[PDB]
Curated annotation (Swiss-Prot), chain A:
UniProt record similarity statement: Belongs to the eukaryotic ribosomal protein eS12 family.
Subcellular compartments: Cytoplasm; Nucleus, Nucleolus
Main function: Part of the small subunit (SSU) processome, first precursor of the small eukaryotic ribosomal subunit. During the assembly of the SSU processome in the nucleolus, many ribosome biogenesis factors, an RNA chaperone and ribosomal proteins associate with the nascent pre-rRNA and work in concert to generate RNA folding, modifications, rearrangements and cleavage as well as targeted degradation of pre-ribosomal RNA by the RNA exosome. Subunit of the 40S ribosomal complex.
PROSITE patterns per UniProt: RIBOSOMAL_S12E
Subunit-structure text: Part of the small subunit (SSU) processome, composed of more than 70 proteins and the RNA chaperone small nucleolar RNA (snoRNA) U3. Subunit of the 40S ribosomal complex.
Pfam families: Ribosomal_L7Ae
Naturally occurring in which organism (per UniProt): Oryctolagus cuniculus
Keyword annotations of the record: Acetylation, Cytoplasm, Nucleus, Ribonucleoprotein, Ribosomal protein
Gene that produces this protein: RPS12
GO molecular function: structural constituent of ribosome
GO BP term, example: ribosomal small subunit biogenesis
Sites of N6-succinyllysine modification: K116
Protein name per Swiss-Prot or TrEMBL: Small ribosomal subunit protein eS12
GO cellular component terms attached to this protein's record: cytosolic ribosome; cytosolic small ribosomal subunit; Golgi apparatus; nucleolus; small-subunit processome
Swiss-Prot record, chain B:
Official protein name in the record: Small ribosomal subunit protein uS10
Portion of the full sequence shown: 18 to 117 of 119
Phylogenetic placement of the source organism: Eukaryota, Metazoa, Chordata, Craniata, Vertebrata
Residue(s) carrying N6-acetyllysine: K17, K58
Origin superkingdom: Eukaryota
Oligomer status and interactors: Component of the 40S small ribosomal subunit.
Swiss-Prot record, chain C:
Modified residues (N6-acetyllysine): K47
Modified residues (Omega-N-methylarginine): R11
The entry's keywords: Acetylation, Cytoplasm, Endoplasmic reticulum, Metal-binding, Methylation, Phosphoprotein, Ribonucleoprotein, Ribosomal protein, Zinc
GO cellular component, one term: cytosolic small ribosomal subunit
Described purpose of this protein according to its UniProt entry: Component of the small ribosomal subunit. The ribosome is a large ribonucleoprotein complex responsible for the synthesis of proteins in the cell.
Binding note for cofactor: Binds 1 zinc ion per subunit.
Source organism (scientific name): Oryctolagus cuniculus
Residue stretches spanning the membrane: none
Stated family: Belongs to the universal ribosomal protein uS14 family.
UniProt-recorded name of the protein: Small ribosomal subunit protein uS14
Binding site for Zn(2+): C20, C23, C38, C41
InterPro entries: Ribosomal_uS14, Ribosomal_uS14_CS, RIbosomal_uS14_euk_arc, Ribosomal_uS14_sf
Cofactor(s) needed for function: Zn(2+)
Curated annotation (Swiss-Prot), chain D:
Modified residue annotations for N6-acetyllysine: K22, K31
Function comment: Component of the 40S subunit of the ribosome. Part of the small subunit (SSU) processome, first precursor of the small eukaryotic ribosomal subunit. During the assembly of the SSU processome in the nucleolus, many ribosome biogenesis factors, an RNA chaperone and ribosomal proteins associate with the nascent pre-rRNA and work in concert to generate RNA folding, modifications, rearrangements and cleavage as well as targeted degradation of pre-ribosomal RNA by the RNA exosome.
Protein name: Small ribosomal subunit protein eS31
Parent-protein start and end of this portion: 83 to 150 of 156
Start and end residues of each stretch annotated as Disordered: 1-13
Compartment list: Cytoplasm; Nucleus, Nucleolus
Zinc finger (C4-type): 39-62
Cross-link (Glycyl lysine isopeptide (Lys-Gly) (interchain with G-Cter in ubiquitin)): K25, K31
Subunit relationships: Part of the 40S ribosomal subunit. Part of the small subunit (SSU) processome, composed of more than 70 proteins and the RNA chaperone small nucleolar RNA (snoRNA) U3.
PTM comment: Monoubiquitinated at Lys-25 and Lys-31 by RNF25 in response to ribosome collisions (ribosome stalling): ubiquitination promotes subsequent activation of RNF14, leading to EEF1A1 ubiquitination and degradation and rescue of stalled ribosomes. Deubiquitination at Lys-31 by USP16 is required for maturation of the 40S ribosomal complex.
Length: 117, 100, 55, 68, 96
C-alpha cells in the first residue's frame, strides 16, 4: 500500500538502494537488476506514459500508480534541503526503482501481497 | 656462542655506566666475558652561514655530533642476554643483539 | 587530456624534485645525512636533533 | 578588466529533450526496437549507447571507433 | 569541486572508524599511502576536509606539510545522520 511504499522508499534511502530517474533505472532494467517499480501517470504526459510503459513492461515488472509527481518527492530523498519544518521546494520524479537488501519488514509482505493476487 | 653486542649513544658517561653495569653483571654471573672494544668516534660536520641574508661579514658556524660505539662479546644464550640487558637501561644508549 | 597534461613535465631530477621538509622551499637545501632542510630552519631546529656547537 | 583581444568562452553544451525516447521506436504491437545499437564492450554495463554519426560510430566510455 | 561519491563516503567511513585524519599539503600524490586499495587523490580529500571545516565540523593543525584534523561532536553527529548508520557504534576514541 501507500505507507508500505513510503516505508520501503525510506529503507532505500537508509541503505542507498535508490535507482531514481530513467537512465540508471533503464540500465538496471537492461542489466536484470530491477526488483520493484513505481510509475506516475495522469499528469502532463501525452506520450511519455506510453514510452515508460513500453520500457517498463518488458520482464515481470510491477507498478504502483501515483496521481501526482510532487506527492512522492518528500520521502524519496531528492528534495532533502532546508529541513527546518517543511522543505524549500518539492520537485517530481517520474519513476523510482527500489533495490533494498533488508527485506525483514512487513511492508515487503504487504507489497508482495499487492503484487501477487 | 660467539655473540657480538653493539652499544651506541650520544653520551659518554651513561654509555660507560651501562657498559660497566653489564660487565659487573657478567662478572657476578661467573661467565667468561670479553672487554669493551672502543670503536673510533665518527664526527658529523655541518658548516653553514649564520645569517639568512647575503649581507654582512662572511661568518660561518660549526655543528658537531659525536658518535660513540662499544662492543661486548659474551658466552651465553639469548635468554640470559635478554634478562641481563632488559633491566635499567640508559635512555641515550641503544643495543643490537646478534649471533655468530 | 588535461589529466595527462597537468603533470606532463617530469620531476625525476632537478631543483624542483627536491623540496624542503619544513617550508617547501627549493633554496639553500642540505642533502647531507638525509636531512633535507633549508639552512635557516636547520639553524633554528639544530638543538633538538643533537647537533651541538663547540668547535 | 578589458583587453584588445576578444574575450574567450566556455562551451556550454547543448541540452537533450527526450532524445533517447526519440530512438526507442516502439509501436502499438509487441515489437521493441532500438534505433541505436547495443554497445559491444564488455567492460561497461548494458545501458550505454554509442554515438551515431553519418560516417562513424563513437563509444561512450570505451572510446572505440566503428568507422566504415 | 566535482568528484565521484565513492571516495567521499570512503573517507567518511575512515572518520567513523577512527577520529583522526592526516593528509600532506601537496596535490601531487595519486594515492593516499594507506588508501592504496581505492583510486583516490589527495586534493579531493583536502577540499572535502576543508569543506567540513567551513561548515564547522573539523579542526585544523598545520606546521610543515601534514594536516591533522579532529572530529568535533557536531561533526560526529553529522557523520552519524549522513552515513545512515545505526546510532549505537562508538569510535575508537571514546572506547579504551
Amino acid at each position: 500500500v501507500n505507507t508500505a511504499l513510503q516505508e520501503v522508499l525510506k529503507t532505500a534511502l537508509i541503505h542507498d538502494g535508490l535507482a531514481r530517474g530513467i537512465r540508471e533505472a533503464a540500465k538496471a532494467l537492461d542489466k536484470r537488476q530491477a526488483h520493484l517499480c513505481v510509475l506516475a501517470s495522469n499528469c502532463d504526459e501525452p506520450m511519455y506514459v506510453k514510452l515508460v510503459e513500453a520500457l517498463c513492461a518488458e520482464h515481470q515488472i510491477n507498478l504502483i500508480k501515483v496521481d501526482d509527481n510532487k506527492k512522492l518527492g518528500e520521502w524519496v530523498g531528492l528534495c532533502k534541503i532546508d529541513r527546518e519544518g517543511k522543505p524549500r521546494k518539492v520537485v517530481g520524479c517520474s519513476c523510482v526503482v527500489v533495490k533494498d537488501y533488508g527485506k525483514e519488514s512487513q511492508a515487503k509482505d504487504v507489497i508482495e501481497e499487492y503484487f501477487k493476487c | 656462542h660467539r655473540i657480538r653486542i653493539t652499544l651506541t649513544s650520544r653520551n659518554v658517561k651513561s654509555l660507560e655506566k651501562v657498559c660497566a653495569d653489564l660487565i659487573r653483571g657478567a662478572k657476578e654471573k661467573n661467565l667468561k666475558v670479553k672487554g669493551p672494544v672502543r670503536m673510533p668516534t665518527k664526527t658529523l660536520r655541518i658548516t653553514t652561514r649564520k645569517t639568512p641574508c647575503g649581507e654582512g661579514s662572511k661568518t660561518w658556524d660549526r655543528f658537531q655530533m659525536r658518535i660513540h660505539k662499544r662492543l661486548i662479546d659474551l658466552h651465553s644464550p639469548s635468554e640470559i642476554v635478554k634478562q641481563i640487558t632488559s633491566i635499567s637501561i640508559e635512555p641515550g644508549v641503544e643495543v643490537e643483539v646478534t649471533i655468530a | 587530456g588535461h589529466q595527462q597534461l597537468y603533470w606532463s613535465h617530469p620531476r625525476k631530477f632537478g631543483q624542483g624534485s627536491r623540496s624542503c621538509r619544513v617550508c617547501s622551499n627549493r633554496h639553500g637545501l642540505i642533502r647531507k645525512y638525509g636531512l633535507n632542510m633549508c639552512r635557516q630552519c636547520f639553524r633554528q631546529y639544530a638543538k633538538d636533533i643533537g647537533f651541538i656547537k663547540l668547535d | 578588466k578589458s583587453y584588445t583581444t576578444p574575450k574567450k568562452n566556455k562551451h556550454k553544451r547543448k541540452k537533450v529533450k527526450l532524445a533517447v525516447l526519440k530512438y526507442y521506436k516502439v509501436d502499438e504491437n509487441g515489437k521493441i526496437s532500438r534505433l541505436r545499437r547495443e554497445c559491444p564492450s564488455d567492460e561497461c554495463g548494458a545501458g550505454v549507447f554509442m554515438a551515431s554519426h553519418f560516417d562513424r560510430h563513437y563509444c561512450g566510455k570505451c572510446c572505440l571507433t566503428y568507422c566504415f | 569541486m566535482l568528484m565521484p561519491k565513492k571516495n567521499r563516503i570512503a573517507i567518511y567511513e575512515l572518520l567513523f572508524k577512527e577520529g583522526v585524519m592526516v593528509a600532506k599539503k601537496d596535490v601531487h600524490m595519486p594515492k593516499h599511502p594507506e588508501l592504496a586499495d581505492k583510486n583516490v587523490p589527495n586534493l579531493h580529500v583536502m577540499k572535502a576536509m576543508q569543506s567540513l571545516k567551513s561548515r564547522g565540523y573539523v579542526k585544523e593543525q598545520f606546521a610543515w606539510r601534514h594536516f591533522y584534523w579532529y572530529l568535533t561532536n557536531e561533526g560526529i553527529q553529522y557523520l552519524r545522520d549522513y552515513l545512515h548508520l545505526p546510532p549505537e557504534i562508538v569510535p575508537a576514541t571514546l572506547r579504551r
